[PDB]
């Protein structure tokens, strides 16, 4: 869907932190 | 639309794809559904005159508005793009509703179904086929992009195959659009696994280079045996991309969508391409793949440049042949319009023996 930058970036940041060594 | 019998025979007055509107009587038979969906239905049929098989794509049409897919396909005439023979209007299951019928060349296989076989068989698609298919894809992309047309839905399912001649034909232009600088577009375009990162970031000012990214995804999938960037959501898919390419730099993010430059994303180390693919993977395939799957849209190779890549050197060998014994299809019959973006590539793209 068409997500606003803030919400999208938050989800992406949360996910990247989990797959980070 | 009329019904006769000589077996059921359907007769309609359909307009040819090329030239001025000069509709002819067209008769066909042996109709059967070879595809259903939310778009409409796809029938196979046999032309009465020629006996040639055709695919009839039937979609719902608002007569007050012009059909974008039709207007685009009528302009296209290329050996690696499915041909629009005729088109006509008719009625269907919905009352008081008019349908658009697209009569296209029937092509038995798709790149998806073929690759899917090798996956089931736990084998890998031979490199020669990868070269052949990808070359013809970029060739078709070079053509449509010269008209400023972007497909916006490049995926294995949309790459038709003739298994006997190894000819690839790009199809499904229901998402295609004339991209014009200054006039923004929908970012919800393109299907899962093959969406460019800028599209995922909701960019609206993207270019035809999104197709090149999709092509890179297709190339990677052929070498891998499975999609390289799977995932249901946009975030899911971006995670996969980052897990391979590493976290995009601020400048790369700016190139895709400036609205994301200020967010601090965790820095993920990139995974070397040589570790992403099997150890038997050809170096030039890997090299080509990395030049297609770039974060920065303008950094990606153009379709024409991709054709000139060293990975397709074997296809320019005069003594090249398909595994089934016969010769390779037409690969060097480039036109001026096709070479419009970069003419000096002709010295590479057209080998000396092809000029004979
Ligand atoms: N000319 C054709 N010949 C054979 N099969 C076709 C042809 N056109 C479409 N199909 C098949 O019907 C499916 C969907 O048709 P398509 O042209 O891709 O429209 P869309 O994807 O928008 O529904 C494709 O996966 C393809 O396998
Ligand atoms: Cl990491
Ligand atoms: Mg399709
Ligand atoms: Mg469609």
Numbering used by the authors:
A (entry chain B): 381 to 401
B (entry chain A): 26 to 31, 35 to 384
Q: What did the published study say regarding this structure?
A:
Glycogen synthase kinase-3 (GSK-3) is a highly conserved kinase that in higher animals functions in insulin signaling, microtubule regulation, inflammatory pathways, and developmental programs including Hedgehog, Notch and Wnt signaling. GSK-3 differs from most kinases in that it is constitutively active and controlled by inhibition, rather than by specific activation conferred by phosphorylation of the activation loop. GSK-3 prefers pre-phosphorylated substrates, termed ‘primed’ substrates, with a phosphorylated serine or threonine residue at the position 4 residues C-terminal (P+4) to the serine or threonine to be phosphorylated (P+0). Here we show that the auto-inhibitory pS9 peptide sequence and the inhibitory LRP6 c- and e-motifs all bind to GSK-3 as pseudo-substrates.
For direct comparison, we re-determined the crystal structure of the peptide inhibitor-free structure of the GSK-3 (residues 1–383)/Axin complex using the same crystallization protocol for the inhibited complexes, at 2.5 Å resolution. The overall structure of the GSK-3/Axin complexes is similar to those reported previously. In each structure, a molecule of ADP is sandwiched between the N- and C-terminal lobes. In peptide substrate-free GSK-3 crystal structures, many of the side chains in the C-loop are disordered, and the loop has relatively high temperature factors, indicating conformational flexibility. In the absence of pseudo-substrate inhibitors, Phe93 does not interact with other parts of the kinase and is present on a solvent exposed, flexible loop. Crystal structures of GSK-3 containing non-phosphorylated Tyr216 show that the tyrosine side chain points toward the N-terminal lobe, with the tyrosine ring packing against Val214. Comparison of the inhibited and peptide substrate-free GSK-3 structures shows that the loop immediately preceding the C-helix, designated here as the C-loop, undergoes a large movement toward the C-terminal lobe of the kinase and clamps down on top of the bound pS9 or LRP6 peptides. The α-carbon of residue Phe93, which lies at the tip of the loop, moves 8.5 Å relative to substrate-free structures.
